[PDB]
Design an enzyme around this catalytic site. Structure first.
Site, PDB file in Angstrom:
ATOM      1  N   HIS B  57       0.795  -1.214   0.000  1.00 28.70           N
ATOM      2  CA  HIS B  57       0.000   0.000   0.000  1.00 28.70           C
ATOM      3  C   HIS B  57       0.835   1.275   0.000  1.00 28.70           C
ATOM      4  O   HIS B  57       0.305   2.363  -0.199  1.00 28.70           O
ATOM      5  CB  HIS B  57      -1.073  -0.033   1.116  1.00 28.70           C
ATOM      6  CG  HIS B  57      -0.577   0.328   2.483  1.00 28.70           C
ATOM      7  ND1 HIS B  57      -0.427  -0.599   3.491  1.00 28.70           N
ATOM      8  CD2 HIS B  57      -0.263   1.530   3.031  1.00 28.70           C
ATOM      9  CE1 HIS B  57      -0.046   0.010   4.606  1.00 28.70           C
ATOM     10  NE2 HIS B  57       0.061   1.304   4.350  1.00 28.70           N
ATOM     11  N   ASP B  81      -0.691  -7.507   0.840  1.00 31.03           N
ATOM     12  CA  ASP B  81      -0.146  -6.163   0.979  1.00 31.03           C
ATOM     13  C   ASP B  81       1.374  -6.180   1.183  1.00 31.03           C
ATOM     14  O   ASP B  81       1.902  -5.460   2.039  1.00 31.03           O
ATOM     15  CB  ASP B  81      -0.841  -5.467   2.154  1.00 31.03           C
ATOM     16  CG  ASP B  81      -0.732  -3.957   2.105  1.00 31.03           C
ATOM     17  OD1 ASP B  81      -0.413  -3.400   1.038  1.00 31.03           O
ATOM     18  OD2 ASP B  81      -1.001  -3.323   3.143  1.00 31.03           O
ATOM     19  N   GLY B 137       3.488   6.583   9.346  1.00 36.83           N
ATOM     20  CA  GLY B 137       4.731   6.364   8.629  1.00 36.83           C
ATOM     21  C   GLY B 137       5.514   5.149   9.090  1.00 36.83           C
ATOM     22  O   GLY B 137       6.693   4.999   8.763  1.00 36.83           O
ATOM     23  N   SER B 139       4.212   1.821   8.676  1.00 41.09           N
ATOM     24  CA  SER B 139       3.830   0.596   7.979  1.00 41.09           C
ATOM     25  C   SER B 139       5.026   0.054   7.208  1.00 41.09           C
ATOM     26  O   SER B 139       5.755   0.813   6.570  1.00 41.09           O
ATOM     27  CB  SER B 139       2.586   0.790   7.099  1.00 41.09           C
ATOM     28  OG  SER B 139       2.277   1.969   6.353  1.00 41.09           O
TER      29      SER B 139
HETATM   30  B1  LIG Z   1       1.724   3.183   6.929  1.00 40.09           B
HETATM   31  O1  LIG Z   1       2.643   4.098   7.416  1.00 40.09           O
HETATM   32  O2  LIG Z   1       1.427   3.452   5.581  1.00 40.09           O
HETATM   33  C1  LIG Z   1       0.326   3.297   7.742  1.00 40.09           C
HETATM   34  C2  LIG Z   1       0.469   3.520   9.257  1.00 40.09           C
HETATM   35  C3  LIG Z   1      -0.829   3.914  10.030  1.00 40.09           C
HETATM   36  C4  LIG Z   1      -0.904   3.688  11.544  1.00 40.09           C
HETATM   37  C5  LIG Z   1      -1.302   5.166  11.756  1.00 40.09           C
HETATM   38  C6  LIG Z   1      -1.139   5.418  10.242  1.00 40.09           C
HETATM   39  N1  LIG Z   1      -0.784   2.392   7.451  1.00 40.09           N
HETATM   40  C7  LIG Z   1      -1.968   2.837   7.035  1.00 40.09           C
HETATM   41  O3  LIG Z   1      -2.214   4.028   6.838  1.00 40.09           O
HETATM   42  C8  LIG Z   1      -3.038   1.780   6.786  1.00 40.09           C
HETATM   43  C9  LIG Z   1      -3.195   1.213   5.410  1.00 40.09           C
HETATM   44  C10 LIG Z   1      -4.454   1.876   4.969  1.00 40.09           C
HETATM   45  C11 LIG Z   1      -5.316   2.294   6.133  1.00 40.09           C
HETATM   46  N2  LIG Z   1      -4.365   2.194   7.249  1.00 40.09           N
HETATM   47  C12 LIG Z   1      -4.636   2.341   8.553  1.00 40.09           C
HETATM   48  O4  LIG Z   1      -3.812   2.062   9.427  1.00 40.09           O
HETATM   49  C13 LIG Z   1      -6.052   2.777   8.936  1.00 40.09           C
HETATM   50  N3  LIG Z   1      -6.607   1.748   9.804  1.00 40.09           N
HETATM   51  C14 LIG Z   1      -7.451   0.840   9.335  1.00 40.09           C
HETATM   52  O5  LIG Z   1      -7.908   0.899   8.186  1.00 40.09           O
HETATM   53  N4  LIG Z   1      -7.845  -0.068  10.225  1.00 40.09           N
HETATM   54  C15 LIG Z   1      -8.764  -1.160   9.873  1.00 40.09           C
HETATM   55  C16 LIG Z   1      -9.971  -1.200  10.822  1.00 40.09           C
HETATM   56  N5  LIG Z   1     -10.737   0.060  10.827  1.00 40.09           N
HETATM   57  C17 LIG Z   1     -11.571   0.442   9.683  1.00 40.09           C
HETATM   58  S1  LIG Z   1     -10.448   1.174  12.016  1.00 40.09           S
HETATM   59  C18 LIG Z   1     -11.731   0.998  13.200  1.00 40.09           C
HETATM   60  O6  LIG Z   1     -10.468   2.458  11.362  1.00 40.09           O
HETATM   61  O7  LIG Z   1      -9.181   0.831  12.649  1.00 40.09           O
HETATM   62  C19 LIG Z   1      -8.047  -2.588   9.737  1.00 40.09           C
HETATM   63  C20 LIG Z   1      -7.365  -3.088  11.033  1.00 40.09           C
HETATM   64  C21 LIG Z   1      -9.098  -3.644   9.373  1.00 40.09           C
HETATM   65  C22 LIG Z   1      -6.985  -2.530   8.598  1.00 40.09           C
HETATM   66  C23 LIG Z   1      -6.125   4.162   9.561  1.00 40.09           C
HETATM   67  C24 LIG Z   1      -7.617   4.517   9.636  1.00 40.09           C
HETATM   68  C25 LIG Z   1      -5.375   5.150   8.653  1.00 40.09           C
HETATM   69  C26 LIG Z   1      -5.511   4.198  10.976  1.00 40.09           C
HETATM   70  C27 LIG Z   1      -4.317   0.353   4.836  1.00 40.09           C
HETATM   71  C28 LIG Z   1      -4.131  -0.215   3.451  1.00 40.09           C
HETATM   72  C29 LIG Z   1      -5.065  -0.564   5.782  1.00 40.09           C
END
Ligand SMILES: *[B]([O])([O])[C]([C][C]1[C][C][C]1)[N]C(=O)[C]1[C]2[C]([C]N1C(=O)[C]([N]C(=O)[N][C]([C]N([C])S([C])(=O)=O)C([C])([C])[C])C([C])([C])[C])C2([C])[C]
Ligand SMILES: [Zn+2]
Lengths: 22, 181
Positions: B57, B81, B137, B139
């Site tokens: 991603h 991913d 930042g 992931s």
């Molecule tokens: B990385 O740096 O790119 C990054 C780090 C992240 C932790 C705080 C920023 N990862 C992401 O941005 C990921 C990637 C995108 C969405 N995302 C998230 O971490 C998101 N979280 C989720 O989507 N969590 C869900 C469950 N929910 C819908 S919830 C209640 O919102 O947590 C899962 C655990 C099912 C994945 C956000 C909302 C940005 C924190 C992807 C591709 C998952």
């Protein structure tokens, strides 16, 4: 599309060290 | 030994953009986790067993810049991913966890290690919730076990009200499966 670039690093292999004076 | 970590910035915004278009990075490499960036974002990449793994991603289908020009990905698994390029000359690899421990430690892009308790095979709960902005930042970063071995790669946070209570990771087993694909 551009290449992913290394902009920094994180080192886990470091161990407690006495910071040297210069 | 206690898991400690430190970060070091190797390049700036202008140098990063130029190196991105060029695909040629002559900087020296050190460490197990590389702070990585694209024009869109910055995340992490962990070297495990000679391969540099990161989040799909974040890297998409891009090449990684190196002294010899762009390097094509070795592994790519959209569904899990994941993406992987051979570990940069200079990097140091982590090794998969064998002990099957449930007390993990997430290493963030600011070189902080936070304890997380493993719940599912891809989930773990922070013992001390932090705002998601803290984790931003990170992931692609490692989830180590007390022995310092890779258990998984951080990919998303399970948050609410802007606070991360748990994390979603990619266990190392999916790496084996990805390579085997
Ligand atoms: B990385 O740096 O790119 C990054 C780090 C992240 C932790 C705080 C920023 N990862 C992401 O941005 C990921 C990637 C995108 C969405 N995302 C998230 O971490 C998101 N979280 C989720 O989507 N969590 C869900 C469950 N929910 C819908 S919830 C209640 O919102 O947590 C899962 C655990 C099912 C994945 C956000 C909302 C940005 C924190 C992807 C591709 C998952
Ligand atoms: Zn272990």
């Amino acid at each position: 599309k551009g290449s992913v670039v290394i902009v920094g690093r994180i080192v886990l292999s470091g161990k407690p060290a006495i910071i040297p004076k210069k | 030994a206690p898991i400690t970590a430190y970060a070091q910035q190797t390049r700036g915004l202008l140098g990063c953009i130029i190196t991105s278009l060029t695909g040629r990075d002559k900087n020296q490499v050190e460490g197990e986790v590389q702070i990585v960036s694209t024009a869109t974002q910055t995340f992490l990449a962990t070297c495990i067993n000679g391969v540099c793994w990161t989040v799909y991603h974040g890297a998409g289908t891009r090449t990684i810049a190196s002294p010899k020009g762009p390097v094509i990905q070795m592994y790519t698994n959209v569904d899990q991913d994941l993406v992987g390029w051979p570990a940069p000359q200079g990097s140091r690899s982590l090794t998969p966890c064998t002990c099957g421990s449930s007390d993990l430690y997430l290493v963030t892009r600011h070189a902080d290690v936070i304890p997380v308790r493993r719940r599912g095979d891809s989930r773990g709960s922070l013992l001390s919730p932090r705002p998601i902005s803290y984790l931003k930042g990170s992931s692609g970063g490692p989830l180590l076990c007390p022995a310092g071995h890779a258990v998984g790669l951080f990919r998303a946070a399970v948050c609410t009200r802007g606070v991360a209570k748990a994390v979603d990771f990619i266990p190392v087993e999916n790496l084996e499966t990805t390579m085997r694909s």
